[PDB]
Ligand binder design. Structure first.
Ligand SMILES: COc1cc(CCc2cnc(Nc3ccc(N4CCC(N5CCN(C)CC5)CC4)c(OC)c3)nc2)cc(OC)c1
Length: 289
């Protein structure tokens, strides 16, 4: 179906180097001429999501679905924003802002201290708290647009040239304008190590399950992109979650942040803070630093 305000001229777009592939799409760099409606002459670097070479019928509806979620949500400094789409007379391309510094996971990994006898700017504690705050701000806006992410992890935050956090990947994102929750009812491919028990066991999704994931992102930030539950099979995760295991506090983490972290990991969804609260919380910490 047509949507002319979002539609983009195909001949103004030149596809470039791959950025990586996901579940139902692949991403490439591209040049889009006159994407900046204030400098209609000059080519802008954008990202383009399109179907993969082995794409199913469902992949196509999933990608259209993700494009609609973005149009819905609206613009925010801490969310990756929709720029346009070629939807008519050719393969679906979705045009999206390009984050120059990749995803946060690799970002953090790439700037760990090398070691005394090793090598090939530096991050500070305040930098890490800033990242957490920005993400919290974007999730706060996301939640107030009556939408659930369902895939919040360091790999799904992208970092611009200016070190701005941008939430990405509306692959599992769901509109909850109605009931204000989501029930999966079906089996699927799930980011299991980031997911709250109620979501994992009982398949119930809320802003509050997103909060749990955000807790895990916190852990990822302060370990500078550590993997939760490394090489642990799903059955063991289940066991450890049922048993009430929580992750240990990272070295680079203060007590204050570990409390905000554990707070996100209350068994009862209702006992967890909201994104709004989390912003306040991280604002305070950002201040004392
Ligand atoms: C709803 O949210 C979204 C989000 C997007 C992602 C839109 C988007 C996606 N990516 C980027 N930037 C970017 C920049 C760099 C890299 N890399 C650079 C280092 C590389 N490295 C070198 C050696 N080796 C080959 C592997 C490791 C590979 C990764 C990268 O990989 C992730 C990504 N900006 C925007 C699209 C979308 O379409 C609907 C919707």
């Amino acid at each position: 179906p047509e949507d002319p305000k979002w539609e983009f001229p195909r001949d103004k777009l030149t596809l470039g180097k791959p950025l990586g592939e996901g579940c139902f799409g692949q991403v490439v760099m591209a040049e889009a001429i006159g994407i900046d409606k204030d400098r209609a002459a000059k080519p802008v670097t954008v990202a383009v999501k399109m179907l993969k070479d082995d794409a199913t019928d469902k992949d196509l509806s999933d990608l259209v679905s993700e494009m609609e979620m973005m149009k819905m949500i609206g613009k925010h400094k801490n969310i990756i924003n929709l720029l346009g789409a070629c939807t008519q007379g050719g393969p679906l391309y979705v045009l999206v802002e390009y984050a120059a510094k990749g995803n946060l996971r690799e970002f953090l990994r790439a700037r760990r201290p090398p070691g005394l006898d090793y090598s090939f700017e530096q991050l500070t504690f305040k930098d890490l708290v800033s990242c957490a705050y920005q993400v919290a701000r974007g999730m706060e806006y996301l939640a107030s647009q009556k939408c659930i992410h369902r895939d919040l992890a360091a790999r799904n935050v992208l970092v611009t040239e200016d070190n701005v956090m941008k939430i990405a990947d509306f692959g599992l994102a769901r509109d909850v304008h109605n009931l204000d929750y989501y029930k999966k009812t079906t089996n699927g491919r799930l980011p299991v190590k980031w997911m709250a028990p109620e979501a994992l066991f009982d398949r119930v999704y809320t802003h509050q399950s997103d909060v749990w994931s955000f807790g895990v992102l916190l852990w990822e930030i302060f370990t500078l992109g550590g993997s939760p539950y490394p090489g642990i099979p799903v059955e063991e995760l289940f066991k450890l979650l049922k048993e009430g295991h929580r992750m240990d506090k990272p070295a680079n983490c203060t007590h204050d942040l570990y409390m905000i972290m554990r707070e996100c990991w209350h068994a009862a969804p209702s006992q967890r803070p909201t994104f709004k609260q989390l912003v306040e919380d991280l604002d305070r910490v950002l201040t004392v630093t």
